[PDB]
């Protein structure tokens with residue numbers, strides 16, 4: 001019996017309570033979990049790589065089997081470099097499901113060792129996404145209930161520099 005290593009890739013822009021729940025659930029089932037923050041070089045995230053990594057560490061660093069790394073390039077090359085057992089993704093809607101079904105099949109064609117496992121959110125996180133959270137924050141809504149406190153403060157310090 002070997003040691004399992006799953007990657008959880010995303011932009012995490014910012015990390016939410018939904019992501020936290022997924023990583024916590026995953027850390028019970030695999031030996032190592034890698035929170036893999038896509039840099040988004042040609043995709044314009046609101047938070048920098050350093051901010052997104054720090055928010056993720058702050059929220060999840062208490063889990064001793066979770067690592068945090070930024071990456072770019074082809075997910076399958078990262079998968080190989082990392083020697084992962086699988087990629088993990090959350091499926092919160094039908095459109096998520098169809099996109100991920102397609103991508104898992106494309107990635108398996110690029111690398112036959114590739115694997116993707118999916119979790120479904122618990123109902124109390126099911127309506128949360130990073131995009132929606134950015135939008136509420138931007139229109140000065142309170143996102144406290146949906147994201148870790150550190151993220152709330154991070155939005156206040158974008159709102160303080162101006163935003």
Ligand SMILES: CC(C)(COP(=O)(O)OP(=O)(O)OC[C@H]1O[C@@H](n2cnc3c(N)ncnc32)[C@H](O)[C@@H]1O)[C@@H](O)C(=O)NCCC(=O)NCCS
Nearest residue numbers: 009010011012018038073074075089090121125128129130
């Ligand atoms: C697809 C990319 C950008 C990351 O995905 P995404 O932008 O959805 O990140 P986000 O951080 O918002 O979410 C991460 C994942 O957890 C899920 N999730 C988000 N919120 C929640 C919630 N409340 N509950 C459950 N799941 C959730 C998402 O649906 C997603 O699967 C990234 O994997 C990537 O760019 N890969 C590298 C490039 C590549 O190889 N591209 C195409 C060739 S296959």
Ligand SMILES: [Cl-]
Nearest residue numbers: 011013130131
């Ligand atoms: Cl996003």
Ligand SMILES: [Mg+2]
Nearest residue numbers: 128129130131
């Ligand atoms: Mg999201």
